[PDB]
Design a protein around this ligand. Structure first.
Ligand code: 2FO
Ligand code: 2FO
Ligand code: FE2
Ligand code: FE2
Ligand code: FE2
Ligand code: FE2
Lengths: 175, 175
């Protein structure tokens, strides 16, 4: 039947043409709408303090510039570098916090639409003792409608930010 | 928990290092094993006469060289060009026959593991009248174990190759 997502098109020129969105305050841009594969380009700079718990895999291809992922691997904080040219496949539920220090960077990220009932988690961890400070689970439909208010409500709440283990109040927006 | 699929790694150098498999007789190479996202690099030259009917989406990013897809769109034969640098998202069930004339070409193709019961189709069409000549449906586990014998059994069988509409016997392996 129909090429529902349109014809093939030149990706570098698309990234060039959307450079103004691959920077603060927007930072990323989904390529196709209403598809099963969620295909996004993510730019920079953006730093962030949440860890994502994705119930499905995520594919990364760092096309331009460098970035890295703060991870929880086997109970310990680790870093996975996404150097320019690198590809990477993240297994389900590995906690990850992408850090994207460079302007002009661009990373292809491919994920799957989550089926009804399969929820995403977003988590913050205590800088002092490492315990989990706060988790929100969300039926994720769009990283535009369902996600910013989630982060904003954490920054706005000393209670949400308060470590249950040691009482230290997480800093909120910037580490 | 674990980085089950390993650390990030440089993709161009991987493609360089696997160049000897991105050519006849192998032609392609899956990047990671036992993952939900099936991530493959496909090289050339390869021409082929089957149309794939994939019950899920396929993502294409033609990294090196040029290729194209013969399609059935809205009842008519069409061609979608994959020029170097192009990306493309194919909707489910659009019949497609990839043609990869160039040596040294490389296309990133990402698909999903099909769940039990969701079958792939492989189809051949009559050059003369355009009617369907033969379809095989397969629970696809690997494009290495389940796929070559399927194609080989079509080439080996004048009966399978015989157009039901006009009686013309499809040529088999090479158009
Ligand atoms: N990989 C993510 C994600 O954490 O799901 C991302 C950007 C937005 C959507 O993927 C990023 O900055 O890499
Ligand atoms: N896109 C395919 C497919 O038809 O599923 C392919 C190679 C092998 C696996 O995808 C190709 O040559 O593009
Ligand atoms: Fe994520
Ligand atoms: Fe703490
Ligand atoms: Fe296919
Ligand atoms: Fe025919």
């Amino acid at each position: 039947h129909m090429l529902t997502y349109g014809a093939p098109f030149n990706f570098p020129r698309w990234i060039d043409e959307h450079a103004h969105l691959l920077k603060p305050p927007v930072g990323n841009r989904q390529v196709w709408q209403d598809s099963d594969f969620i295909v996004t380009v993510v730019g920079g700079p953006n730093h962030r303090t949440d860890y994502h718990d994705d119930p499905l895999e995520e594919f990364f291809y760092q096309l331009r510039g460098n970035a890295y992922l703060n991870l929880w691997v086997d109970g310990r904080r680790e870093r996975a570098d996404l150097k320019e040219g690198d590809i990477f496949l993240l297994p389900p539920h590995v906690r990850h916090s992408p850090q994207r220090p460079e302007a002009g960077s661009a990373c292809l990220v491919i994920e799957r639409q989550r089926p009804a009932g399969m929820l995403d988690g977003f988590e913050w961890y205590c800088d002092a003792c490492g315990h989990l400070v706060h988790r929100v689970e969300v039926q994720l439909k769009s990283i535009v409608t369902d996600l910013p208010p989630l982060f904003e409500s954490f920054y706005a709440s000393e209670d949400k930010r308060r470590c249950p283990h040691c009482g230290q109040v997480h800093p909120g927006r910037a580490a």
